[PDB]
């Protein structure tokens, strides 16, 4: 059973968002993690869907790309899980890349 999070990585100048996929069993799964961009600039559709490793009770986090950090951005995440018997999702809110690391 594959757990799903979405997570913003404040850096310097740079959020790089990526969703934390815990994982209750050490093996390999597929999951697609999909990023939701919206500031000044309009609004910009991330999406990477395929297969990684994961480990047991371990923190997978995926689909890492790096959006350019503003705290009044809109920064949002969606991740399903889907692979055998697991299927899930989740979405991150905007409002927490305040300065997550």
């Not at 999406?47 to 480990?55: D, E, H, L, P, V």
Request: hydrophobic share 40%; glycine share 10%; proline share 1%.
């Amino acid at each position: 059973m594959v757990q799903c999070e979405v997570e913003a990585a404040v850096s310097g100048g740079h959020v790089t968002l990526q969703g934390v996929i815990t994982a209750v069993r050490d093996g390999a799964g597929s999951y697609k993690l999909a990023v939701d961009k919206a500031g000044a600039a309009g609004t910009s559709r991330i999406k990477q869907a395929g297969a990684f490793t994961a480990i047991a009770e371990q923190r997978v986090t995926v689909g890492n790309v790096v959006l350019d950090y503003s705290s009044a951005n809109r920064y949002a995440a969606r991740l399903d899980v889907s692979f055998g018997s697991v299927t899930i999702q989740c979405n991150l809110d905007p409002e927490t890349v305040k300065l997550e690391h």
